[PDB]
Amino acid sequence: CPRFLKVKNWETEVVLTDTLHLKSTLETGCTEYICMGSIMHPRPEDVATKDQLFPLAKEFIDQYYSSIKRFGSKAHMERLEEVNKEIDTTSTYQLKDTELIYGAKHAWRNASRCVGRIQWSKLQVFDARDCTTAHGMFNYICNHVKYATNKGNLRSAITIFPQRTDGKHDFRVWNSQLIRYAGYKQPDGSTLGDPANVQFTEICIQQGWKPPRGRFDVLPLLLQANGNDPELFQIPPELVLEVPIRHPKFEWFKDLGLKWYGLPAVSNMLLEIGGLEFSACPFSGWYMGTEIGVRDYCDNSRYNILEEVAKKMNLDMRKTSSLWKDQALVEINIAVLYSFQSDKVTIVDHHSATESFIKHMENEYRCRGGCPADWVWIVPPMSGSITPVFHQEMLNYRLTPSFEYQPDPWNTHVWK
Amino acid sequence: RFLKVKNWETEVVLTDTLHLKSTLETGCTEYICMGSIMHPSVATKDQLFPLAKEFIDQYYSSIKRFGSKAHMERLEEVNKEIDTTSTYQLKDTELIYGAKHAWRNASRCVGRIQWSKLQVFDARDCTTAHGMFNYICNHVKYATNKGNLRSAITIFPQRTDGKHDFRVWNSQLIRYAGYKQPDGSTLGDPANVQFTEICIQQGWKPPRGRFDVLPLLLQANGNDPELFQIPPELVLEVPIRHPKFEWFKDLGLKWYGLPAVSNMLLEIGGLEFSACPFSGWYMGTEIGVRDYCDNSRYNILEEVAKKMNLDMRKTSSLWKDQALVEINIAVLYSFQSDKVTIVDHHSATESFIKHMENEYRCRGGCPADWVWIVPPMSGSITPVFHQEMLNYRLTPSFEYQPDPWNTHVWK
Ligand code: HEM
Ligand code: HEM
Ligand SMILES: Cc1cc(N)nc2cc(-c3ccc(OCc4ccccn4)c(CN)c3)ccc12
Ligand SMILES: Cc1cc(N)nc2cc(-c3ccc(OCc4ccccn4)c(CN)c3)ccc12
Ligand SMILES: C[C@H](O)[C@H](O)[C@H]1CNc2nc(N)[nH]c(=O)c2N1
Ligand SMILES: C[C@H](O)[C@H](O)[C@H]1CNc2nc(N)[nH]c(=O)c2N1
Ligand SMILES: [Zn+2]
């Protein structure tokens, strides 16, 4: 593998040099003869063996002591020996609080698909490894929601529940995000609410949830502790900050009855640190406007509102070459940013966010020797080429600590 | 192994077997993906015969006569020729097959539903830049067809020793000049400031306007390049106006109807065709987003947003996004009103999805570069954004080559 790789920005001519790729530890899915860079995702009994765990832990511990400028120190060699004994006697080990915080921040720093990583070192880490029950998980999650929401001055945070042991005692949040809206398939084939969440909604209903059957119903939490069957909990509604969507010019936009929640909090990913696996680790930041205004609202398989907005805008919808879809899409994203800013709920537009990411990427190249980035995900879903990331070459590779995908828990759970 | 690609909007899953036929590299490895790198980085008789044999085999497999008498005789024929000349010449049928398949295999091209409808002009008998100019004029006239554009490619003689290359020095046959001003800024098209200066330095008298059609700069058989003015009645242009903003025409904008890329290399069966201008018709965003609104291109967003009286102090007003849509409405409206072929990015990406379906069914796959296929605006409200794609390299192909003014040893 070549030692220095160059990436160029075709708009500014800036050339950056990447050496950090030499530290990559996992597979991308690509080969020498095929590129899988647009593939979205390129056994539960199996946990890391002693022999697998030793090198992964040393690699992380080494990285941690190098970061605090104590590599090779007495404290470094003693921590190595203590970890090695734990793995020897118990087949696993426990991270120190300092290492847990370092690992979580670096999984975010390493998340190649995240345009928001300029913030990676300002992450509030909540240590929930003492949790034993689903009620306890509910408590930790409510506190997380309240802290991160901060009455609209959102603060990035992660809550980390106990790590995997034998694979039969996993902690899991069954929700894909802490706050999402229910979706309901009707007998006639139409959908009320968010079509993305129909399957999960049906699971909640089977578990006993009584659905209000509206368009914007906050879903309950479905929480699994220690491998037990999951349990339902209603998030207290005063903890769910929401924004009604209105438009600065179009007085009729409010009459569409749209709203969205303030806190994006992904809850179905796995955090890997030093070979340890944290299967329940909900983390939250704040929104980029297009996540709501382009994807959530205008995806055909989501709320799919382009049609109705175009009608109320009295656009010619007969020919595609009028660009009526594009024109309505901009107005919708204007409304989303206006409504969040008016209510003083943190949000970032796609111009500001991508401009910050370029500055972040350049700094990471300077101080760290690189910045893994997934162009397919970094470039926003509208107006791609009038953001600076479109013209920026990126290298994608997988560093650890990392956030990973994991199978949906209803597909693997053994019901008690 | 068989590879699956999913459309996350329609849940259609296609199965790729065609990738198993590739042997050229992508630039990625198991540990690093270079899918967003623009260019991830003179044969011998021994390099040349396996390449020739592979291409002959796939041609005779394509015409349902694999292992036939003609197939066996063509292989032996090509064998003797590489032996005794260090190269070989393609039959006419093979030239046409190879050129259509280079287009078919172009992973970055969203227009490939048209790939088998390509007019192939054989220019392998050309010897001088005057001959190149004649062949190119005939291409332009045929492809333009009074607005009813027709896809075409003109293929000049192949590389021999690398010292006698035919080259079109222009990056496209029709482009507008760019002028580096005294006060530091740029008049015209900044993409072409360097090429324009080379044309001036070679004797071209520049009109110094905003849309000055560049001359052709043509190199035959490795000689110094020579300048030629394309006859203006051959250059079809469209004044851009808006269907609702009557002030838009006062911007003074125009563009040319014929996109004709002239700086790429065509590779067929180990042979290299360093001059092979090819042309189709525009997707509107190529003009309305990239050519007009790239920071390093015509950069007209501020001006348009001014005349729209948009609030420009905060990025979160999305004033850039509003002006961008209006510019692209004007381009599509202007070409359509003048009956010049153009396709919008919704229709084009929709056609590409259908093309992918066809290729998976009849060919076992379709190499496709998501980074290039997804249009530069309104990405996720086009169907290709939600379509998983596999990128891999098949030959015959179009390849990049160095700019001639970095190689050419003058005399
Ligand atoms: C603080 C403000 C943040 C912003 C503006 C932001 C922005 C984004 C956006 C726009 C995406 C693409 C999402 C999509 O297309 O649906 C994304 C993905 C991602 N973000 Fe960030 N993010 C933020 C905070 C965080 C935090 C706090 C973490 C973890 C601690 C994180 C980790 C990730 C990961 C792992 C992904 C990839 C998700 C996947 O592959 O499915 N982000 N982010
Ligand atoms: C007929 C209508 C066609 C349409 C609408 C079309 C559309 C496009 C577009 C939009 C691009 C991306 C260009 C950019 O972003 O700057 C592209 C790339 C490309 N097209 Fe097509 N195209 C057409 C015809 C053709 C033909 C006739 C050929 C060759 C015979 C061809 C070969 C290519 C190649 C090689 C590329 C990639 C260029 C590169 O890698 O730098 N296309 N096409
Ligand atoms: C912290 C934060 C802030 C912010 N503003 N946005 C964020 C977006 C994500 C995010 C996006 C897309 C995802 O996957 C879509 C998918 C996958 C497979 C199939 C269908 N769809 C997932 C999967 N967990 C997460 C994660 C964290 C974010
Ligand atoms: C046949 C046809 C029809 C149509 N409608 N559009 C077409 C666009 C291209 C096309 C686009 C971008 C390109 O690369 C930009 C670049 C590279 C390196 C450095 C700077 N810039 C090249 C490389 N020549 C070609 C090619 C053919 C087209
Ligand atoms: C097929 C394609 O990979 C898929 O639609 C991806 C494209 N890029 C994306 N980019 C972001 N940020 N989020 C997404 O969900 C997707 N979806
Ligand atoms: C850095 C990146 O590869 C570069 O900007 C690419 C991105 N995608 C593109 N897509 C198209 N269609 N045309 C382009 O010129 C580019 N440029
Ligand atoms: Zn790749």
XYZ file of C-alpha atoms in Angstrom, chain A residues 1 5-7 10-11 21 24-41 294-295 298-301 306 320-323 325-327 329-331 333-334 337 341 349-352 375-376 381-386 390-391 393-398, chain B residues 3-5 8-9 19 22-39 289-290 293-296 301 315-318 320-322 324-326 328-329 332 336 344-347 370-371 376-381 385-393:
132
model
C 0.000 0.000 0.000
C -2.008 9.547 -1.112
C -3.021 12.927 -2.546
C -6.532 14.372 -2.710
C -10.895 20.854 -8.193
C -12.335 24.294 -7.370
C -5.120 5.631 5.683
C -7.163 1.578 8.527
C -8.359 -1.586 10.235
C -11.590 -2.785 8.552
C -12.785 -3.544 5.029
C -14.583 -1.080 2.760
C -16.198 -3.627 0.456
C -14.239 -2.410 -2.544
C -11.635 -4.526 -4.304
C -8.963 -3.766 -6.873
C -11.478 -4.524 -9.642
C -14.785 -3.205 -8.258
C -15.836 -0.164 -6.246
C -18.793 -0.487 -3.874
C -18.754 3.108 -2.688
C -22.480 3.589 -3.342
C -23.596 0.367 -1.572
C -25.390 1.282 1.639
C -24.130 -1.684 3.727
C -35.276 17.027 1.411
C -35.231 13.467 2.751
C -39.726 14.924 -0.111
C -38.552 11.315 -0.442
C -41.269 9.422 -2.312
C -41.142 6.677 0.330
C -43.641 17.822 -3.143
C -40.812 17.608 -15.621
C -38.735 20.186 -17.519
C -40.545 23.025 -15.728
C -38.531 21.836 -12.673
C -40.203 19.493 -8.152
C -36.930 21.403 -7.745
C -38.742 24.681 -7.152
C -38.014 21.431 -2.806
C -36.176 24.723 -2.247
C -39.228 26.405 -0.736
C -36.111 23.696 2.872
C -36.440 27.472 3.225
C -34.681 26.524 8.335
C -34.362 29.578 13.593
C -28.025 24.826 6.604
C -26.197 22.705 4.051
C -23.999 25.595 2.861
C -22.669 26.396 6.339
C -18.422 11.620 -0.605
C -21.663 9.800 -1.440
C -29.125 15.676 -1.222
C -29.940 18.984 -2.946
C -27.802 21.615 -4.699
C -24.760 19.330 -4.601
C -22.331 21.245 -6.784
C -22.977 24.654 -5.207
C -18.901 18.425 -4.300
C -15.557 19.526 -5.765
C -11.801 14.603 -3.574
C -12.090 12.378 -0.498
C -10.525 9.123 0.637
C -12.792 6.643 2.418
C -11.420 4.113 4.899
C -12.458 2.579 8.217
C -23.226 -9.139 -6.408
C -26.571 -7.527 -5.607
C -27.573 -3.875 -5.913
C -33.941 1.749 -1.685
C -36.995 3.579 -3.038
C -18.252 -7.446 -13.186
C -13.341 -6.987 -15.833
C -9.549 -7.122 -15.535
C -8.519 -3.441 -15.306
C -8.168 -1.773 -11.904
C -10.463 0.761 -10.222
C -7.953 2.353 -7.840
C -9.775 1.161 -4.717
C -8.485 -1.578 -2.429
C -10.090 -3.650 0.315
C -8.954 -0.960 2.770
C -9.301 2.352 0.877
C -12.031 3.518 -1.512
C -11.145 6.122 -4.148
C -14.653 6.439 -5.601
C -14.525 10.249 -5.450
C -11.040 10.655 -6.974
C -11.307 12.078 -10.462
C -8.331 10.188 -12.000
C -25.525 24.252 -12.808
C -21.892 23.494 -13.640
C -22.789 28.447 -11.477
C -19.496 26.762 -10.561
C -17.351 29.211 -8.586
C -14.527 28.613 -11.080
C -25.491 33.115 -9.132
C -26.794 31.456 3.438
C -29.785 29.909 5.255
C -32.161 31.934 3.066
C -31.103 29.457 0.328
C -28.236 30.349 -4.056
C -30.593 27.380 -4.350
C -33.481 29.566 -5.547
C -29.948 27.905 -9.301
C -33.385 26.424 -10.066
C -34.429 29.513 -12.029
C -31.931 25.776 -15.019
C -35.573 26.499 -15.890
C -34.415 24.055 -20.622
C -36.930 23.662 -26.125
C -33.698 17.558 -18.103
C -32.098 15.693 -15.221
C -35.401 14.062 -14.167
C -36.035 12.551 -17.595
C -22.851 7.082 -8.636
C -20.614 10.089 -7.945
C -25.325 18.276 -9.453
C -28.682 19.608 -8.167
C -31.806 18.099 -6.593
C -29.958 14.802 -6.122
C -32.373 12.838 -3.966
C -35.504 13.794 -5.920
C -29.766 8.901 -5.886
C -31.556 5.931 -4.299
C -30.032 3.349 -6.639
C -27.048 1.294 -5.527
C -24.491 1.017 -8.332
C -21.353 -1.039 -8.886
C -18.418 0.635 -10.611
C -15.917 -1.438 -12.585
C -13.882 -1.095 -15.756
